[PDB]
Each structure stands twice: as C-alpha cells, then as structure tokens.
Amino acid sequence: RMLFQTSYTLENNGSVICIPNNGQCFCLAWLKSNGTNAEKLAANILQWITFALSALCLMFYGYCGWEEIYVATIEMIKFIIEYFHEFDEPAVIYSSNGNKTVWLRYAEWLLTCPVILIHLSNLTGLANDYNKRTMGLLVSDIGTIVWGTTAALSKGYVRVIFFLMGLCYGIYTFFNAAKVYIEAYHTVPKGRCRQVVTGMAWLFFVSWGMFPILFILGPEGFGVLSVYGSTVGHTIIDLMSKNCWGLLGHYLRVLIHEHILIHGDIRKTTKLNITEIEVETLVEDEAEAGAVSSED
Amino acid sequence: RMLFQTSYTLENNGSVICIPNNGQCFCLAWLKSNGTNAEKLAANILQWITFALSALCLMFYGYCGWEEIYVATIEMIKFIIEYFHEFDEPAVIYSSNGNKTVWLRYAEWLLTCPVILIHLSNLTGLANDYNKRTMGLLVSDIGTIVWGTTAALSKGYVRVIFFLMGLCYGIYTFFNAAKVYIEAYHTVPKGRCRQVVTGMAWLFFVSWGMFPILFILGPEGFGVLSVYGSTVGHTIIDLMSKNCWGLLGHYLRVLIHEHILIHGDIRKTTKLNITEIEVETLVEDEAEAGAVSSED
Ligand SMILES: *[C@@H]1O[C@H](CO)[C@@H](O[C@@H]2O[C@H](CO)[C@@H](O)[C@H](O)[C@H]2NC(C)=O)[C@H](O)[C@H]1NC(C)=O
Ligand SMILES: *[C@@H]1O[C@H](CO)[C@@H](O[C@@H]2O[C@H](CO)[C@@H](O)[C@H](O)[C@H]2NC(C)=O)[C@H](O)[C@H]1NC(C)=O
Ligand SMILES: CCCCCCCC/C=C/CCCCCCCC(=O)OC[C@H](O)CO
Ligand SMILES: CCCCCCCC/C=C/CCCCCCCC(=O)OC[C@H](O)CO
Ligand SMILES: *C\C=C(C)/C=C/C=C(C)/C=C/C1=C(C)CCCC1(C)C
Numbered sequence: 354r355m356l357f358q359t360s361y362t363l364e365n366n367g368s369v370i371c372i373p374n375n376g377q378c379f380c381l382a383w384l385k386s387n388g389t390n391a392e393k394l395a396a397n398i399l400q401w402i403t404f405a406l407s408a409l410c411l412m413f414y415g416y417c418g419w420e421e422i423y424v425a426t427i428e429m430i431k432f433i434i435e436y437f438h439e440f441d442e443p444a445v446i447y448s449s450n451g452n453k454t455v456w457l458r459y460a461e462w463l464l465t466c467p468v469i470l471i472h473l474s475n476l477t478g479l480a481n482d483y484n485k486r487t488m489g490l491l492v493s494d495i496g497t498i499v500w501g502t503t504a505a506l507s508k509g510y511v512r513v514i515f516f517l518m519g520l521c522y523g524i525y526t527f528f529n530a531a532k533v534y535i536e537a538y539h540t541v542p543k544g545r546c547r548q549v550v551t552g553m554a555w556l557f558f559v560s561w562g563m564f565p566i567l568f569i570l571g572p573e574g575f576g577v578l579s580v581y582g583s584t585v586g587h588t589i590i591d592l593m594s595k596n597c598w599g600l601l602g603h604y605l606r607v608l609i610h611e612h613i614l615i616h617g618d619i620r621k622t623t624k625l626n627i628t629e630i631e632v633e634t635l636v637e638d639e640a641e642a643g644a645v646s647s648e649d
Numbered sequence: 650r651m652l653f654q655t656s657y658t659l660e661n662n663g664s665v666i667c668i669p670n671n672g673q674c675f676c677l678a679w680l681k682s683n684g685t686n687a688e689k690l691a692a693n694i695l696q697w698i699t700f701a702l703s704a705l706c707l708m709f710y711g712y713c714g715w716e717e718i719y720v721a722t723i724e725m726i727k728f729i730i731e732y733f734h735e736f737d738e739p740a741v742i743y744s745s746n747g748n749k750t751v752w753l754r755y756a757e758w759l760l761t762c763p764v765i766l767i768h769l770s771n772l773t774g775l776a777n778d779y780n781k782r783t784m785g786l787l788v789s790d791i792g793t794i795v796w797g798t799t800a801a802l803s804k805g806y807v808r809v810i811f812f813l814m815g816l817c818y819g820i821y822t823f824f825n826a827a828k829v830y831i832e833a834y835h836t837v838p839k840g841r842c843r844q845v846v847t848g849m850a851w852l853f854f855v856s857w858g859m860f861p862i863l864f865i866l867g868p869e870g871f872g873v874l875s876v877y878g879s880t881v882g883h884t885i886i887d888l889m890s891k892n893c894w895g896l897l898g899h900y901l902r903v904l905i906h907e908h909i910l911i912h913g914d915i916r917k918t919t920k921l922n923i924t925e926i927e928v929e930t931l932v933e934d935e936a937e938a939g940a941v942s943s944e945d
C-alpha cells in the first residue's frame with residue numbers, strides 16, 4: 354500500500370540492498386512499524402469521538418463567534434484527511450535523513466493559532482480592538498511552531514537547538530497568555546462567568562503545556578512513544594485544546610452578551626497590581642461604576 | 650558531501666540499483682542538479698548583497714520600531730544558515746515522493762508574516778490598538794502559507810488543490826491589505842508621507858504578488874526554473890519584500906513622529922466611500938480639524 358519502495362533484496366550477506374529501478378525513493382527507516390494494533394484501535398476510536406464532537410459543536414454554533422466555528426471547521430477537514438490519507442505523504446513527511454514528520458499536526462496548529470490567540474484576546478466578545486500584547490502573543494506562538502517544526506525535521510544537536518529556540522518563544526507566549534487570563538477574570542461579572550474563565554485558563558495551560566511534553570516523548574524526541582501512541586496522546590489534548598475550549602468560549606460569550614441584554618454594559622475601574630494594570634469590570638449594579646484599586 | 654546515499658551500482662542492465670547497507674536514505678530524484686554555475690554564482694552575489702543590506706539596516710535602526718529590526722534580525726540568521734547549510738536537510742527537505750522543498754524559505758515567511766502584517770496594521774506608528782481587519786489579515790495569510798507549503802510537499806492533483814486553497818486565502822489577504830493602504834494614505838499628512846505610503850503599497854503588491862508566480866515557475870510547480878534560478882528570483886523579491894519595505898517603513902514612522910514634534914497630533918474626520926469608511930487625517934494646521942466626507 355506505500356508509494357515509496359517497499360520491496361527489496363539483501364545481497365552479499367546483507368551488506369547490499371538491491372531495488373527495482375522504477376524511480377521510487379527508498380529507506381528502511383520509513384518502514385518501521387507505527388505501533389501495536391491496540392494503539393492503532395485506541396487511536397481510531399478517539400478520532401471518531403473527535404469527529405462526533407467536531408460535528409456537534411458546528412451544528413450547535415449554527416443556531417462574532419467566528420473563532421470557535423473555524424477551529425471546528427479545520428478539525429472536521431482534518432478528520433476527512435486522516436480517514437483517507439493519515440500516513441500518506443504529506444500528512445506524514447518521510448525525509449532523506451529517515452525522519453517521519455506529522456506535517457498534518459503542525460499545519461493544523463499554524464492554521465488555528467491566530468484563531469485561538471485572537472479568541473484569547475477576545476474572551477468576553479465585547480472588544481472591537483486588540484492591544485500591543487495580542488501582537489506579541491501571535492508573533493511568539495508562530496515562532497514557537499516554526500522552530501518546533503524545524504526541530505522535528507532535524508536530528509542530533511540541530512534538533513536540540515531549534516527545540517530550545519521554540520521553548521524560549523514558548524515561555525514568552527505562556528507568560529503573556531497568563532496576564533490576559535488575569536485581566537479577563539477581573540473584567541467579567543462576579544458569578545458563573547468567572548467560573549468559566551477559570552475553567553478556560555486550566556484547559557489552556559494544561560493542554561498547551563502537554564504539546565512540548567508529547568514532542569520530547571515522541572519519535573521527534575527520545576522515541577519513548579510509538580506513532581499510534583503519539584496519535585492517542587494528541588487526540589486527548591486535541592479534544593481539550595480545540596473542541597472543549599471553544600465550547601466553553603462560546604458559553605462564556607453567551608453569558609456576557611446576556612448580561613448586556615439584562616443589566617447592560619456597566620463597567621468599573623479595577624486597578625490591578627499583579628505592576629500597575631487597569632481593567633473595566635462588568636457589574637450587574639448601575640450604582641457600582643467607580644475606581645477599585647485591587648492591588649494583587 | 651551529501652548525507653543521503655550518493656554511491657550506487659546499476660545491475661541487470663539498469664533494472665536494479667544496489668546500495669551499501671549503511672542505513673542511509675536513497676533516491677535518484679534528490680541527486681538532480683540544482684542548476685548552472687552561472688545561476689549559482691548570481692545567487693551567491695545577491696545573498697551577500699542581501700547580507701550587507703540586512704547588516705546596514707540593523708545598525709541604522711540601532712540609533713516602537715520593533716517590526717523592522719526583527720525582519721532584519723531573521724534575515725541575518727537566514728544568511729548565516731544559507732552560508733553553512735543552504736542545501737542541507739532541513740533547509741531543504743528531501744522527501745519520499747522525491748520532492749525538494751525549501752523549508753528555509755517557508756519557515757522565514759511564517760516567522761515574519763505577523764511582524765510584516767502587524768507593521769501593515771501600524772504604518773504611522775501612532776496606533777496602540779488593532780481593529781478586527783488586522784486579525785483577518787493574519788489568519789488568511791498564515792492559511793495561505795500553510796496551504797502553499799502543503800502544495801510544495803505534495804504532487805499531482807493534491808498539489809493543485811492545496812495551491813487553489815492558498816490562492817483563495819491569498820485573495821482575501823490582498824483585498825483587505827488594499828483597504829489598509831487606502832486608509833493609511835488618507836490618514837498621514839498631505840506631503841512626503843503620502844509619497845512613502847504610495848511607495849510602500851507598490852513594493853508590497855508587486856513583491857507579494859511575485860511569490861505565487863515563483864511557486865508556479867519553480868520545481869514546486871511546472872519546473873521551468875532551476876533551484877539556483879528560484880533562489881536568484883527569491884533574493885530580488887526578498888530585498889524588496891523585507892529590507893527595502895522596512896526601510897521605507899522606518900522612514901515613514903520618523904516623518905510621522907517628527908510631525909507630532911513640530912505641529913502636534915491634529916486629526917480630522919475624512920469620511921471615505923471607496924462603502925462608508927472613516928479616517929483621522931493628521932494635518933499641519935490647527936484650524937483644520939473637521940469632517941471632510943471625501944466620497945471615492
Ligand atoms: C555475514 O555477516 C554477519 C554479520 O551479522 C556475520 O554474522 C555474525 O558473525 C559474527 C562473527 O564475526 C558474530 O559476532 C555474530 O554473532 C554473527 N551473527 C549475527 C546474527 O550477527 C557472518 O559471519 C558473515 N558471514 C561472512 C561470510 O562474512
Ligand atoms: C537493456 O535495456 C535497454 C533499455 O534502454 C535496451 O536498450 C535499448 O533497446 C531498445 C530496443 O528494444 C531500443 O528501443 C533503445 O533505443 C535501446 N537503447 C537505449 C539507449 O534505450 C537493451 O536492448 C537491453 N538489453 C537486453 C539484453 O535486454
Ligand atoms: C514554559 C512551558 C513549560 C513546559 C515546557 C517543557 C520543558 C521541556 C524542556 C526540556 C529541556 C530538555 C532538552 C530538550 C531537547 C529536545 C530535542 C531532542 O529531543 O533532541 C533529539 C536527540 O538529541 C537526538 O535523538
Ligand atoms: C490575487 C493575487 C494575484 C496573483 C496570483 C497568481 C495566480 C496564479 C493562479 C493560477 C492558476 C493555475 C493553476 C495552479 C496550480 C498549481 C499547482 C501545480 O503547479 O501543480 C503541479 C502539477 O500538477 C504536477 O507537476
Ligand atoms: C490545534 C490546537 C493547538 C492548541 C495546538 C498547539 C500546539 C503547541 C502549543 C505547540 C507548542 C510547542 C512548544 C511550546 C515548544 C516546542 C515546539 C512545540 C511547537 C511542540
């Protein structure tokens with residue numbers, strides 16, 4: 354079934370490989386097993402469940418809001434490609450140094466990173482503007498993925514360097530993502546909205562933190578995980594990172610917009626000090642509309 | 650000098666290739682010449698000249714302004730890698746379907762696309778905020794590059810489809826980039842500043858428009874251009890796209906900031922209709938500060 358050379362003969366007591374002169378690329382490295390049938394079976398189940406959640410989130414969003422639908426849109430196109438060509442090039446890149454690189458995974462990331470990070474910069478959905486910090490988040494995160502993809506394509510000390518360059522960009526991303534969530538928390542009304550923001554923060558840092566961990570564990574790192582093993586781990590954090598996070602996002606947005614429908618846009622001036630930061634706290638009381646320096 | 654297999658024997662009248670069983674990947678496709686010595690020589694000269702311009706722009710910017718320096722920073726790191734490992738994997742990816750993909754080129758693009766597009770969204774350097782349109786520009790442009798990179802890694806009708814998907818995202822980018830330049834033109838003071846904005850628009854559309862043209866002409870498309878031929882074409886549009894555009898950008902920014910130093914921030918309300926758009930026209934006269942509906 355492969356469309357590289359899979360048939361060869363060993364000659365001179367396995368010191369020579371002879372192949373048909375049919376123009377196909379050849380490498381033993383490419384033919385290594387992707388894992389056990391149990392790992393594969395587990396991966397095909399989690400993918401269908403991902404397809405189901407992607408399908409239901411989309412129809413649900415069908416009843417502003419563009420970031421959640423798009424991540425579900427990209428996720429459904431991803432599943433149709435997995436279904437037909439999951440291990441066909443270039444869903445997997447089989448390269449000259451013998452590496453298998455899951456370009457399918459890194460491509461989806463590059464596609465939706467702006468969408469997710471714009472949504473990070475718009476949790477309430479009320480903003481029409483994005484600050485300087487949003488721009489640093491996008492630049493740092495895209496650098497991270499570009500260095501990481503380069504690390505996956507490389508070997509030896511070149512892989513180590515590009516991974517370290519990704520980690521430096523990544524730390525800058527995590528640091529600034531943390532400030533956004535802190536501002537969001539003190540912006541939204543006091544009740545359920547702050548539960549959802551707290552939920553989104555946990556989902557975000559755990560699921561995003563797991564990507565560099567799965568890199569180090571996978572064939573791109575120390576080869577602890579098999580390819581199916583890596584797919585299974587990716588499906589779990591994929592469900593958290595995309596479907597669940599966007600679902601919680603849409604829910605938060607609904608709650609905020611309903612607050613404007615009942616109480617109206619009643620802002621405050623919570624001056625944080627987690628520094629000398631400032632925030633417009635939506636409240637349910639018209640009376641409350643003053644400067645509350647809550648130095649953290 | 651290659652670190653894939655370069656030594657082989659033809660057997661049974663060229664129907665069989667025999668290779669040392671040394672674990673190296675092998676493909677004839679990878680060994681095709683990259684072009685003539687004249688093409689190579691031309692490419693090495695334009696690269697040094699690019700290194701020189703990248704070096705001088707950086708020192709010059711050394712005497713806010715972060716987008717121009719970064720593009721020169723990424724450009725210098727690019728040249729040191731070209732100098733030592735231009736045709737080593739993964740600066741070029743040699744893949745199982747026989748393709749050579751210049752990952753070096755696509756990586757630089759992904760890295761700086763936010764930087765350039767943020768700078769597009771900040772020509773005057775006075776804005777502290779970015780509108781909804783900036784976000785669509787970044788999402789569309791990163792999609793374009795992801796589809797294009799996928800097209801370069803693919804073959805046959807799969808390459809055609811991903812290229813078309815890139816073109817659809819690309820058209821959305823070009824359309825919205827055009828509106829930004831139109832707003833910028835009617836925002837800046839009447840004199841030299843509008844010459845520079847006009848210069849930046851021409852540089853941008855010509856240099857950005859040439860990338861899909863060089864794709865179609867290169868090994869990733871109809872193979873009209875050789876690899877050195879493609880490098881030469883890339884160096885020319887690289888000089889325009891990065892160094893020259895950022896230099897004109899820094900110059901514009903200086904002019905605008907000097908306007909605030911002499912006349913001060915005197916805005917207007919030029920209501921454009923190229924629709925029902927609005928603009929804050931910086932003027933050199935305190936008197937002029939009214940609504941000028943200039944329906945285009
Ligand atoms: C064919 O090459 C193989 C290399 O595997 C040789 O087999 C082994 O021989 C050495 C003895 O020098 C042992 O260390 C290994 O234990 C042997 N077996 C294996 C499975 O590795 C074999 O001797 C060679 N034959 C000739 C004629 O050179
Ligand atoms: C070895 O294979 C080659 C294939 O190139 C054969 O060479 C050619 O033979 C055919 C005649 O059937 C001609 O059409 C070509 O013009 C020949 N030359 C070349 C350069 O292509 C050759 O006949 C084969 N030998 C044997 C014993 O099968
Ligand atoms: C801020 C977010 C917090 C979470 C961040 C997770 C921290 C992971 C860092 C590990 C350093 C260890 C070195 C990593 C080098 C990776 C490259 C590699 O695997 O090298 C290939 C090998 O040398 C040839 O087979
Ligand atoms: C909006 C910006 C204006 C400028 C935009 C430029 C327009 C280029 C479009 C061409 C369509 C022609 C089809 C292109 C298909 C490309 C894929 C390809 O080369 O296919 C490989 C081939 O089939 C196997 O060798
Ligand atoms: C599809 C959805 C998401 C959220 C994908 C996220 C991917 C990452 C956060 C990747 C992060 C990396 C880091 C932090 C450093 C090493 C290289 C990586 C790209 C794996």
Ligand SMILES: *C\C=C(C)/C=C/C=C(C)/C=C/C1=C(C)CCCC1(C)C
Pocket residue numbers: 757758761765793794795796797798812815816819857858860861864890891
């Ligand atoms: C390094 C600096 C720049 C400005 C790089 C730009 C690259 C592009 C504009 C690429 C555009 C593409 C398009 C429009 C459609 C086909 C795929 C491409 C990625 C080549």
